[PDB]
Symmetry: C2
Subunit: 705 residues, 2 copies
């Protein structure tokens, strides 16, 4: 058999290695190599890699680090020639960036690999080695090679000098350069996140362990790339790293990290709501070598955020409220109505997500016109795009905002996710359709991300979207429609306002809903209004109409009328899906004019929290007792209750099951923890049973030493 497709196989694994020749004795031989790689030393402290739980050297590219080489006799520039080498993959080649000869230079030059001798003492040489800020990101093998008249002598393989080179947000020349220390700490070095969920008028918050500095996670991130068969030459490009790595998050057929499941039962797996962070998922991915079950969007985003921050690409998780996923770049979503004004539930099949999470990753975009760098949206939860059912992005958030959705990747899809209109259409009994009105403000209503400060939410709606109704927004849509956005149904689009408001309620309580009508006309109207209320998944998918009601309203001239109804706990209580989401349509026909009024609202019931307590001394290297408390407030008994505890630098992720919990009963779980990370830290918990799940709790702790 001949290798006729190419002379050397793709170099697409960091784990694979070649064996370099040592010979390829008055000449220099190296007796020792010192990397000054302790976590308190200069290199890791200054490279901002001292948090990794890893005893190998770890630097960031584009920036100098110090090494010392000890020789058999003193190096003498009049007769000796040596260089350090960095090698990666089974098939390294200099012109692919995977064999890197580092030349001894008099002065370091910006942008280039080089090694300057900064000290010469007895048989030792100290070097300041600068890597290219374009360098491939991975774990390299280091060698020293000595050039003689007879050939090259080289050190033997030594795993103790293996060096990780990562992306460098502090380096001005790096594509990932971020010029604000507060931002770098949050978006690169903070290992604890906050995810926003619930619904726009009742924003819920939960904590998430990114856990990027934990033991084994860096190596797992490299493994992800190897399992993608990612060419080593693309691993210094933060765009392709985002592109490929996000494609690995969703598992298709035994090939990526997380199996997606939205089925509310999760039979041979763990429920998406049980995860407390990315650590146990990634390490189970790596140890099993097979997808982990199961995830949904915030779990994909959690894990992907860990991947990016671990490699050094600044990253954050975004929550969009009222999200059109499945858009296919079309900007109109339809609600169909019967001739009397009711919602047609046979035909209304497209749903709005109450919220949806994706990721943003900071980088220049030298593939695009100037102005498109900064945050790039990446959504690893698949939707139909130009190529098939896949992740979307990296798409420039600036390009999305301006409508310039020809620039890669998948910009039209993220654009439609936050900018679609709802179209209310009557489906008539003769089979024709009539367009009743349009809602342009519902989708992409609020977009938020964790603040830099602490756990508050930051409103980043206007980074994706210009002001509704105004000229920049109009210009962006006009340009978007040239480049793959679609909005086919032209909306050449009486004098009655209708709204409604739904109270937020604790799980198991009743709640009120009231509908408001304003007649600004001088004539009287008879209206028939319909209330339709469904149990839904957080994606908007409706499971059942749990309440339905019709209201006969007469409206006087120049009048305001409010109507109220009580929803009782027993109308929804055995029927909720996980996350306890509810959806409300209020639709109505004005008899005199045949106009339609229409409004939608989402609610989630408030799920009770876990209580976490601590007794003892809170010190790196010392024992503390953590108590995890859960009180079952339901009038039924919860079964197979798995409790999860987490908190990076404080404990590995752990879980504990309780066979049942009788009504109104409490359980307590005690674990002795021994912290390895000092300072402001956090303990984090979740609970999943065979019914009630999406239960969380956290506790901020401060650690000493």
């Amino acid at each position: 058999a001949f290798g006729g497709r190419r002379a050397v196989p793709p170099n697409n694994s960091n784990a694979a290695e070649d064996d370099l020749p040592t010979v390829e004795q008055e000449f220099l031989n190296v007796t020792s190599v010192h990397l000054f790689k302790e976590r308190w030393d200069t290199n890791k402290v200054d490279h901002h890699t001292d948090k990794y739980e890893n005893n190998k050297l770890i630097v960031r590219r584009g920036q100098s680090f110090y090494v010392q080489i000890d020789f058999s006799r003193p190096y003498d520039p009049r007769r000796d020639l040596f260089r350090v080498e960095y090698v990666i993959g089974r098939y390294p080649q200099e012109n692919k960036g995977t064999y890197i000869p580092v030349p001894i230079v008099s002065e370091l030059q910006s942008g280039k690999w080089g090694a300057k001798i900064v000290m010469r003492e007895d048989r030792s040489v100290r070097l300041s080695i600068q890597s290219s800020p374009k360098c491939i990101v991975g774990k390299f093998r280091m060698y020293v090679a000595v050039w003689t008249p007879y050939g090259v002598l080289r050190t033997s393989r030594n795993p103790e000098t293996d060096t990780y080179i990562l992306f460098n947000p502090w380096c001005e020349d790096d594509a990932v350069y971020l010029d604000n220390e507060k931002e770098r700490e949050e978006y690169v070095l903070n290992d604890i996140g906050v995810i926003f969920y619930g619904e726009v008028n009742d924003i819920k918050t939960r904590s998430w362990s990114y856990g990027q500095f934990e033991d084994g996670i860096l190596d797992t991130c490299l493994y992800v790339m190897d399992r993608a068969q990612m060419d080593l030459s693309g691993r210094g490009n933060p765009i392709k790293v985002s592109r490929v790595g996000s494609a690995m998050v969703n598992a298709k057929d035994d090939e990526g990290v997380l199996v997606g499941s939205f089925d509310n039962i999760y039979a041979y797996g763990v429920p998406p709501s049980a995860w407390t962070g990315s650590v146990d998922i990634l390490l189970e991915y790596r140890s099993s070598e097979n997808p982990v079950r199961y995830g949904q969007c915030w779990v994909f985003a959690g894990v992907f955020n860990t991947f990016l921050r671990c490699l050094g690409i600044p990253a954050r998780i975004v929550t969009n409220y009222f999200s059109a996923h499945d858009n296919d770049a079309n900007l109109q979503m339809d609600i169909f109505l019967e001739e009397d004004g009711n919602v047609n539930s046979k035909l209304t099949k497209d749903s709005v997500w109450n919220y949806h999470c994706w990721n943003e990753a900071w980088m220049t975009r030298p593939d695009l016109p100037v102005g498109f760098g900064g945050w790039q949206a990446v959504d690893s939860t698949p939707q139909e795009n130009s190529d098939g059912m896949y992740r979307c992005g990296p798409a420039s958030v600036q390009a999305i905002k301006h409508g310039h959705v020809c620039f890669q990747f998948d910009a039209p899809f993220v654009f439609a996710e936050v900018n679609s209109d709802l179209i209310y259409i009557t489906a008539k009994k003769d089979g024709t359709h009539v367009v009743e009105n349009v809602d342009a403000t519902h989708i992409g209503k609020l977009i938020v991300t964790k603040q830099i400060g602490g756990d508050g939410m930051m409103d980043i709606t206007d980074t994706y979207k210009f002001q509704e109704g105004q000229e920049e927004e109009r210009l962006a849509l006009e340009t978007a429609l040239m480049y793959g956005a679609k909005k086919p149904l032209n909306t050449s689009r009486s004098n009655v306002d209708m709204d409604f408001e739904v109270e937020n309620a604790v799980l198991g309580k009743d709640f009120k809903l009231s509908i408001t009508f304003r007649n600004n006309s001088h004539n009287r109207y008879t209206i028939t209004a319909y209330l339709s209320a469904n149990i839904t998944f957080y994606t908007g998918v409706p499971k059942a109409e749990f309440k339905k009601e019709t209201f006969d309203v007469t409206l006087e001239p120049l009048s305001f009328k409010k109507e109220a109804v009580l929803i009782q706990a027993g109308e929804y209580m055995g029927q909720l899906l996980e996350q306890a989401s509810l959806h409300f349509f209020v639709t109505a026909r004005i008899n005199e004019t045949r106009d339609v009024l229409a409004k939608q609202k989402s609610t989630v019931l408030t799920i009770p929290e876990i209580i976490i307590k601590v007794r003892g001394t809170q010190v790196v290297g010392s024992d503390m007792t953590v108590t995890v408390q859960f009180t079952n407030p339901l009038k039924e008994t919860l079964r197979n209750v798995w409790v999860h505890l987490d908190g990076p630098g404080v404990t590995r992720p752990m879980k504990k099951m309780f066979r049942e919990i009788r009504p109104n009963s409490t359980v307590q779980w005690e674990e002795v923890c021994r912290p390895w990370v000092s300072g402001h830290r956090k303990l984090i918990a979740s609970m999943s049973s065979d019914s009630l799940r999406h239960v969380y709790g956290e506790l901020d702790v401060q650690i000493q030493r």
Copy 2:
């Protein structure tokens, strides 16, 4: 606890073969009854009749109705009593997939209309007779492409009455190059005939200076092939709502061609052995490949780039997207959008073959598909390059395109899909670099004219070649090229090495040779200087695969020359048959480097050439009446030209409209022996046809032949 579908309310509608059940009666509300009843439906779908002739679908070997979108066709509906416009409301419906929805284009109610409208579905009553109505139905020119189920539905006050499932009225709707509102519109019949209706092609191979040709059965009208193309899309899980978009059919279709794991049509293999499958070189056309993929439901072994191109070209023309195969001579594949490929030299001027690891393909085939691009700025419609042989792109190891050829030409490579890669495939430079014993490297000179030297495709009136190099590349060494380069580098193309750069130059020429013959090479040195120089030149000649990958150096010569001022000096080299015979790989490619050091200046001259030995042709002969429906005898002859005995010799015979693909094995053929294979064929298509053949053995392969034949129609 549930088992609920919480990702979305309706599963993706991504299979044309899956179907829903439409109710024959659906009443809602309160029934408190002889409304119109359908007794039969007639589609006038016979291949001699006007629907298929006018829709240019009569060549399909398929008894169902097949029309092209955007264009009217006639049907007749016979009801149980006479249609009464006073009070009857009915319409035709077309439905596709298991989850059809009107707002996704997959449930399509066709309203009765007084006049057809441009761009819209509608049906006009053109005749009423007894208990029948004749309709002229016009489909939207944006319609999903695929095989639709047809129903007739009758509206009552209480709900609808509807025909039952009938496979006899299943109607394929395809892309329509004749319809001026269809994205695939092509404005003249000569191009429509060549790029849509011709089911026979020509593939250009060899090397720039020795262009070789063979024929390929596209076979898009043969029995089973249309259904196979729909199956391809179902195995890709292609959302039905994207199947009327030629850009996304091209995008998804071409990703199915190259099999990764158990998914896709063809397993690629470049190993010269092909154990456990059929050599890429043996295939004569797409038909046997597609039908084996369909019946086995697994990838077919094996393909290389022209085999992927042949199959993809079938897929496109069969659905109605105009398409053609192009060959680029000296192709930089695996470029990573980088425009510089290296040749490393030793310090004396020889090629360093340990470090020289990137290779240029002697040729490389891909496809062009014709459509508008309403996703890009105006001006970028027309031919779109789609290369289904994977290379590393921005996403991984995948097919590239569709990339607008106009965008590639101008350097606008930001515009999807994968334009920088196709751009570097034809615009890369060669860089000759000395790798010194101390580990440093010095750039000696750059060849900007070698890669993408000639791009060709089959001519419209015939089997000749059309040079379309101008469609990808502005004039070399000019301003339009420079601007296009400058623009490309802003949008993902890469050319990191600055070439500061430039007395004496050199070229050489190699005679083309029949397999087993001696040939010559002649090197010319031109000294344009007033100085006399001395030179040491090196010739290295390698056996290679067609991709350029070298196997071994078969010939090595060095020589010294002195060049007078202002003169030319030639040096000729004889290559004897014995120096290459017995070492050749399939396609019999040879590669030559001529490098030289000028002693007085240390300048380096470097030049490369490829050649392929000419391989003997199979002989095809015919006797008997050449008439549709009558028997004719085809004779295939192959003579072993070698002095070795060939073993396990497979001969394939093909010819769309004349025979299905067939093959026969001969256990051994002796030196100079001729084998003969006679087949009785009964053609089913009249007109200018062709019989095509290939031969493949355990050693010798990449052997073809053909014969043009005129098949007559029958009667009187």
